[PDB]
């Protein structure tokens, strides 16, 4: 067999200096807070939800609202979401306290999270009541019927 | 596809190393590989090439050639460099005093040089007293005086020697070598 030689060093060289400085994410124009979204993947696929805040994790903060849909406050990915043209005035909804660590991983649900869900749902519902059939629209699931062509549909 | 104007993957056709496996010859190549690479003197690159040459391309240089080279105008005190064997010549009537650097000296050649107050150094000692080959004079032996060259390019009206085993009146002298026996070529 071919024996190893003294000159076959095992030292691991350091990597070169990388010039990949990350630059902030660009969202689509259709993703404006208060816009109603359709979730395309996950457990809640087909659910219509309300977009509240753009988190720093490059994700979107979204509510059902829970009392309407059963979808709680959670993050979603922009690329797994169809942004419709319907909008809800969310100027009266305080989404300031929600950040990345709010969703940090620590069934039994946190009391603070449930209270925040209720507090957000209050203002969200009070605004939703203004537009007729919006509450009925949210609670219904989206699906593709026979003959719907998404390349022709307006959302 | 490419239209090749020349032949592809052609080696240079020059020796890049000695065919020999002499360990001491390889130390001279090591020493003169460094000098040729690191000095930028033309003498160093010439010596490095000569160390690669085969035996017939390093003919012996007689002690008479060195005598004739030392007799050039202003060359009486130059360091004679011979990449090969320096041999004796009994035909010389006198030999001057000079420093000769050579791969090998015969017993006779070394004797005469020292007997006349000269110095016989090797090529490694040369790199000490002349790392750039200052004040040197490279001498080469006669290549076409070899016996095998007598028969090269033999043909009609060429004047080269036939490849023959025996020499005499009965050995390729009649027809084609004599106009009384047909023709002469």
């Amino acid at each position: 067999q071919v024996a190893p030689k003294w000159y076959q060093s095992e030292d691991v060289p350091a990597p070169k200096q990388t010039r990949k400085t990350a630059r902030p994410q660009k969202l689509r124009a259709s993703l404006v807070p208060g816009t109603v979204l359709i979730l395309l993947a996950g457990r809640f696929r087909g659910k219509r939800v309300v977009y509240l805040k753009n988190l720093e994790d490059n994700t979107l903060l979204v509510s059902g609202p829970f009392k309407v849909n059963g979808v709680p406050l959670r993050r979603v990915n922009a690329r797994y979401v169809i942004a419709t043209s319907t909008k809800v005035n969310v100027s009266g909804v305080d989404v300031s306290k929600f950040n990345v660590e709010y969703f940090a991983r620590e069934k039994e649900i946190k009391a603070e999270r449930v209270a925040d869900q209720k507090s957000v749902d209050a203002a969200l519902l009070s605004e939703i009541k203004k537009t007729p059939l919006l509450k009925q629209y949210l609670a219904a699931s989206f699906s593709l019927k026979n003959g719907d062509r998404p390349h022709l549909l307006k959302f | 596809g490419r239209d090749h104007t020349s032949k592809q993957h052609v080696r240079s056709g020059h020796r890049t190393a000695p065919k020999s496996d002499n360990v001491y010859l390889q130390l001279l190549v090591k020493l003169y590989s460094f000098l040729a690479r690191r000095t930028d003197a033309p003498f160093n690159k010439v010596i490095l090439k000569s160390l690669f040459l085969s035996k017939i391309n390093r003919p012996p240089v007689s002690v008479s050639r060195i005598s004739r080279a030392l007799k050039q105008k202003g060359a009486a005190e130059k360091t004679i460099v011979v990449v090969g064997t320096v041999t004796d010549d009994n035909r010389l009537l006198e030999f001057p005093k000079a420093t000769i650097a050579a791969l090998r000296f015969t017993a006779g050649a070394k004797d005469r040089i020292l007997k006349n107050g000269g110095e016989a150094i090797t090529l490694d000692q040369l790199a000490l007293r002349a790392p750039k080959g200052q004040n040197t004079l490279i001498v080469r032996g006669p290549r076409n005086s070899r016996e095998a060259v007598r028969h090269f390019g033999f043909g009609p009206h060429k004047g080269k020697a036939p490849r023959i085993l025996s020499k005499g009146r009965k050995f390729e002298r009649a027809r084609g070598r004599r106009r009384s026996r047909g023709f002469k070529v």
Binding site: - | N90, R169, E172, A174, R177
Partner: protein, 148 residues
């Protein structure tokens, strides 16, 4: 060594380097020097001119000892002088006392005159000398003594 021959490299290739068309055969062209005047004439004429025919007279029972006469030139004549006394001889030699060089006892027949001598008298003993060799020897003050 058989292992460095090309026979070991030709293994696996059909013709062993002899070609498929030519088909290495027993003796195409004949044996030895066959056809030297018929179908090998183009080779003998080109490379061995003078091969065919007779030149000169025969010599029945040629004894090569008669023609023994090795040559020595004048540029090599001082090598026959004893090595240890060469330098002493080259300095003190005169017409009253010059070194004697017996070329015959060293195995030479004729002294030829190529080269130049040291400007030193010598007494050369030879069976034969050339005209120019003896002129050069007397020119340095020497002489040639013919022996048998």
């Amino acid at each position: 060594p058989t292992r460095l021959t090309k026979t070991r490299k030709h293994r696996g290739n059909v013709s062993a380097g002899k070609g498929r068309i030519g088909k290495h055969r027993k003796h195409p062209g004949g044996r030895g020097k066959a056809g030297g005047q018929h179908h090998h004439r183009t080779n003998l004429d080109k490379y061995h001119p003078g091969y065919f025919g007779k030149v000169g007279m025969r010599y029945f029972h040629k004894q090569q000892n008669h023609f023994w006469r090795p040559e020595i030139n004048l540029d090599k004549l001082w090598t026959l002088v004893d090595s240890e006394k060469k330098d002493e001889y080259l300095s003190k030699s005169s017409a009253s006392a010059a070194p004697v060089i017996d070329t015959l006892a060293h195995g030479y027949g004729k002294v030829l005159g190529k080269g130049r001598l040291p400007e030193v008298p010598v007494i050369v003993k030879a069976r034969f000398v050339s005209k120019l060799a003896e002129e050069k020897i007397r020119a340095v003050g020497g002489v040639v003594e013919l022996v048998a």
